[PDB]
């Protein structure tokens, strides 16, 4: 039979007022003989009607993939509202329901600090700039690096780790040519999270 997977918006989309956050109900293994799927959507139990069905996609294994997308308001998602997708289909003795929402719990402001390369790293062709982000809840977050208004893409970020006080932490490491560091360039760690003032903070870092 068909199966249902329900996915939350991207943190960035819920955090940037100039973006459009959406929830997505994916139905896989829809049969060739009964491709018709009905979607009902609920916001905190109240039915909404403004969902839209994405174009049907046939799969390599002879089944269809049917998807409904519901647009959501930034603040409803941020206020913890619960979104329910209900899927009906003839090959399904009973309808399938899924609910997702933001993780529950009082939000806590990330503590963002930058950390220069170790003295011991100064021997290498390349140096590590560290951004530590800690004490944040919930775990939904975006971390990016930039310099002179341009994105710096040579970074990697650890997944969030649960800490012993019930908040999360992560580290982000940007790797740069030692010479760019010596040349006195300013590098910035950008963090986006619901519990920051205007969802955004920036910490900078340069040769001392």
């Amino acid at each position: 039979g068909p199966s249902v997977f329900l996915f939350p918006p991207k943190p960035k989309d819920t955090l940037m007022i100039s973006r459009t956050p959406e929830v997505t109900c994916v139905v896989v293994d829809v049969s060739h003989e009964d491709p018709e799927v009905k979607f009902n959507w609920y916001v905190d139990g109240v039915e909404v009607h403004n969902a839209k069905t994405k174009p049907r996609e046939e799969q390599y294994n002879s089944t269809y993939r049917v998807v409904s997308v519901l647009t959501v308001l930034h603040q409803d998602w941020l206020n913890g509202k619960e979104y329910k997708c209900k899927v009906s289909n003839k090959a399904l003795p009973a309808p399938i329901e899924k609910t997702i929402s933001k993780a529950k719990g009082q939000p806590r402001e990330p503590q963002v600090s930058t950390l220069p390369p170790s003295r011991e790293e100064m021997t290498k062709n390349q140096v590590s700039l560290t951004c530590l982000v800690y004490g944040f809840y919930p775990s939904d977050i975006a971390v990016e690096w930039e310099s002179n208004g341009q994105p710096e893409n040579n970074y990697k970020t650890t997944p969030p780790v649960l800490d012993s006080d019930g908040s999360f932490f992560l580290y982000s490491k940007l790797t740069v040519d030692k010479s760019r560091w010596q040349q006195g360039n300013v590098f910035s760690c950008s963090v986006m999270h619901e519990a920051l003032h205007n969802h955004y903070t920036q910490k900078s870092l340069s040769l001392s």
């Binding site: 955090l15 940037m16 007022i17 100039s18 990016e144 950008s190 003032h197 205007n198």
Partner: peptide, 13 residues
């Protein structure tokens, strides 16, 4: 005040 990210609006209070 407002916050911007790479020129794109984030949020305003």
């Amino acid at each position: 005040d407002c916050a911007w990210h790479l020129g794109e609006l984030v949020w305003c209070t």
